[PDB]
């Protein structure tokens, strides 16, 4: 999730 990466 962060910045849309992975978690």
């Known amino acids: ?4 990466i992975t978690d």
């Open 1 to 4: 999730g962060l910045l849309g």
